[PDB]
């Protein structure tokens, strides 16, 4: 329970053991659960002294204490991480990665992870200082099980922030340098190492389809689908996001997902008690129904159409909106027989009930989907039959009411619907 005054006196004492004790006291201060005095320590000028202590190879305890203290300062706001980087901490922590003491190199891994996790700019600043080579070198073991559990989780967590934060995305030469280690961690049997690895994959799969292909060419889609069925929600969440990111690319990447068996887990994901899992699974479905007709057929053959109908009927509103997108994409690219099957599953009634929604976008998407279905009924000539189906579930009241409000495309499409199929 030292004061900041006493810590500064100790650090300025120019006695190596007094400095250690003061640094230990600073660690204990920045270690408490109640609000630490981070800005107080920053303002005192202690960060350059801590950074210089990182290089006292003779006194390993003061290396450890400074690393810990600096780690906790870097764990806070972006201004506080900035202060740590401004003290020269990045190259010194990279030098400490090679410490012969496991807890000190672990602390340097933690610190570099905190620094890189602040955003794009510090992430590439760490990469330019050459952290990636010794970071991966700490995993150059035949069997990852011989490593200490916390050591491995910290390395995985730091690797994931090195893959994190788009605009701009991580450099390609760095992603290729990390990816084989990332795959090896994705097969490792530790629930938290698996979570962080899937997070890293999900970070790498968010963006243009070149990056998606870069991840898929390493063959991780099977492992991602396997993890999709895990019992740990912290694992399933990032797996589902990486899967959802992968099915935003070419139809060939979507296929490579489907072939792995991903559609078989979706009956669970579309009935998951966690709203966010439902939303992510429905969004993934919508990007699959925007694919080729045989892919829509794969969705049908797994009986997922009744689950989409269920998600459109009773779900969180965001999930319903995602389901509406899925149905519009299905009706947009589906064979006439497939739209028949979608209507035979009961899609019309919840589709009408959501016209009374308070969201302009969802209404546009639903009305657009109705245009698709009517276009399919014209090809079959059964336009009046669908007309009366929309009659019996109270749809035509909602189209006539909607044919007149703020947005332009809404009244345009809905007036087109009235004047073409109800007269």
């Amino acid at each position: 329970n030292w004061s900041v005054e006493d810590i500064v006196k100790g650090i300025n004492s120019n006695n190596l053991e007094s400095q250690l004790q003061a640094t230990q006291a600073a660690r204990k201060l920045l270690s408490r659960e109640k609000q630490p005095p981070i800005d107080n320590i920053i303002r005192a000028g202690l960060i350059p002294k801590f950074v210089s202590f990182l290089g006292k190879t003779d006194c390993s305890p003061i290396q450890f204490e400074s690393a810990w203290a600096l780690t906790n300062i870097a764990s806070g706001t972006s201004e506080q991480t900035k202060a740590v980087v401004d003290g020269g901490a990045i190259p010194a922590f990279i030098s400490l990665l090679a410490s012969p003491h496991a807890h000190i190199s672990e602390q340097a891994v933690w610190a570099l992870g905190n620094i890189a996790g602040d955003g794009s700019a510090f992430r590439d600043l760490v990469i330019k200082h050459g952290a990636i080579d010794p970071l991966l070198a700490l995993l150059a073991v035949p069997d990852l099980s011989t490593l200490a559990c916390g050591y491995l989780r910290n390395l995985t967590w730091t690797l994931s922030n090195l893959c994190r934060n788009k605009n701009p995305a991580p450099p390609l030469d760095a992603v290729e340098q990390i990816l084989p280690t990332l795959v090896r961690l994705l097969h490792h049997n530790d629930p938290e190492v698996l979570a962080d690895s899937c997070w890293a994959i999900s970070y790498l799969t968010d963006g243009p389809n070149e990056r998606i292909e870069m991840v898929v060419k390493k063959g991780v889609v099977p492992q991602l689908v396997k993890l999709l069925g895990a019992t740990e929600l912290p694992i399933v969440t990032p797996a589902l996001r990486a899967i959802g990111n992968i099915v935003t690319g070419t139809d060939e990447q979507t296929q490579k997902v489907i072939d792995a068996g991903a559609l078989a887990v979706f009956p669970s994901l579309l009935t998951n008690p966690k709203t966010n899992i439902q939303k992510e699974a429905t969004w993934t479905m919508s990007n699959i129904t925007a694919g080729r007709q045989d892919q829509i057929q794969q969705v049908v053959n797994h009986g997922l159409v009744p689950f989409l109908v269920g998600v459109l009927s009773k779900a969180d509103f965001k999930t319903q909106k995602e389901a509406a997108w899925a149905i519009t994409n299905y009706t947009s690219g589906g064979t006439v027989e497939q739209i028949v099957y979608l209507v035979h599953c009961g899609i019309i009634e919840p589709l009408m009930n959501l016209l009374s929604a308070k969201d302009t976008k969802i209404i546009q998407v639903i009305l657009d989907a109705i245009s698709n279905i009517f276009q399919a009924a014209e090809k079959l000539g059964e336009t009046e039959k669908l007309s009366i189906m929309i009659e019996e579930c109270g749809g035509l009241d909602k189209i006539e009411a909607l044919q007149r409000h703020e947005n332009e495309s809404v009244y345009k499409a809905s007036l087109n619907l009235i004047e073409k199929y109800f007269s």
Binding site: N245, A290, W325
Partner: peptide, 6 residues
């Protein structure tokens, strides 16, 4: 009819 990203 296109795929929607995050």
């Amino acid at each position: 009819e296109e795929k929607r990203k995050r």
